[PDB]
Design a protein around this ligand. Sequence first.
Ligand SMILES: CC1=C(/C=C/C(C)=C/C=C/C(C)=C\C=C\C=C(C)\C=C\C=C(C)\C=C\C2=C(C)CCCC2(C)C)C(C)(C)CCC1
Ligand code: SF4
Ligand code: SF4
Lengths: 80, 69, 124, 38, 153
Amino acid sequence: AHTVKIYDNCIGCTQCVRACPLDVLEMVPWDGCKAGQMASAPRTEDCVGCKRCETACPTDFLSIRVYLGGETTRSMGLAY
Amino acid sequence: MIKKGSLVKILRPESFWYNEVGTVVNVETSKVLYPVLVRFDKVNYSGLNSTNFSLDELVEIKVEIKSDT
Amino acid sequence: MPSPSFLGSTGGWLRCAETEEKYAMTWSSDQQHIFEMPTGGAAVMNSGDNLLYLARKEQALALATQLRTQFKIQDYKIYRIFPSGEVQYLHPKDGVLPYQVNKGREQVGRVKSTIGKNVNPAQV
Amino acid sequence: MNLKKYLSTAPVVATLWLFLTAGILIELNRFFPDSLFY
Amino acid sequence: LTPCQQSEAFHKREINEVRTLENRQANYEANSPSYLALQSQIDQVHKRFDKYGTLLCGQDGLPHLITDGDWRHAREFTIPALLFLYITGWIGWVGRSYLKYTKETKNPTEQEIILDVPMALKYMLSGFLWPLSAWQEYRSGQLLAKEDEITVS
Ligand SMILES: CC1=C(/C=C/C(C)=C/C=C/C(C)=C\C=C\C=C(C)\C=C\C=C(C)\C=C\C2=C(C)CCCC2(C)C)C(C)(C)CCC1
Ligand code: SF4
Ligand code: SF4
């Protein structure tokens, strides 16, 4: 489906999973940040790509990118 | 190594903010790749004020010490 | 398991829901209450855990987000596959995703510049 | 005091100046024609 | 294309326009005061045609003019109706620019754009001789900018 790629601009303020609808991203301990959190998206098969994390993403250029890819039932958000 | 609060010039490999004048909020010794947050008066479209920046970025902007009367 | 009663049809007896994977949530519900479904009107919440059927994943997470704002209750959502495979996709760590956990890992993470360079040096 | 601050707002100043510019032109087309001399 | 004082096909339009206006003019009694102003209106009509005749005007009765720069017709373009627009518009523009120079300082920038002290608007009259002084200050604008622009990346 969609391709989630995390920039190196992360501050770890958990804005992803707070905004994110179906919890695509996930906070993971990391050793190269101020707060110490990093966003990671294992369940990219279930990602829909609604692009609501780029709104809550603080950085000048956003830190969580999701490039538009293929479309499946998991990424169309349809109930049928 | 420079002291905190210096007037900055953004030379980030990605953000070509060609010498947008701003000040250093604070200096951190935690040693990461994009640490420094600076007061960026040009409110980007995202709406925030201060974002993270590299160690490249700024070298100096006063350029003078004793000849600057 | 005792589940809230809802009238109005719409949600049930859909062929697509039967042939497609379905979601099953639950909540503690220590007290009798009354809530709203993300796709229905109003319904009374009974004591103990309550199992429902959901056809979308966003429908399965918005209800948990709405429950967390009411009272403080741990949420469990289980996501079933087409045949009969039942896997715990929600809270596989059992730790809340925004909060920090010990079980850490990285999936699909490129550590390059910000303007672009879409090539990934390593997938794992 | 504060009435002058409300008088100093963008819409009030704009309408006041535009009233001046419009009235000068209403009086211009009513009084002398442009002489225009080569 | 001949001038209209010699163009017989222009004076016929004056006669025809007054003829169309005359049918509306004669239906009402001229002695009434509310319609005595129509004679002053047709006086304005008459006093309008004579000035345009001096300008070269179309043989058809549609009065054309000149913008090539011909000194005989500088009145329709170059000198009056043109240069004053440039000066008056820029007397406003360079005055706004001077206000843009005094748009910073300590008091909030938003307060100094919108809720300005009326005194700056009263000072606007400063620009009697913009040209070269404005050129100096615009040089200084480009200079002190020091090529500080947006990324466009
Ligand atoms: C010649 C003449 C004259 C003069 C006049 C004048 C001087 C005028 C003016 C004026 C001014 C001084 C101004 C005006 C104006 C207007 C405006 C100003 C508007 C508008 C609008 C628009 C068109 C828009 C645009 C835009 C923007 C804003 C940005 C983005 C994009 C867009 C497009 C959206 C006189 C009468 C004396 C005489 C006769 C004739
Ligand atoms: S949106 Fe970016 S900066 Fe904010 S918590 Fe997520 S990874 Fe960190
Ligand atoms: S791509 Fe859409 S669904 Fe996935 S984390 Fe970003 S905002 Fe949430």
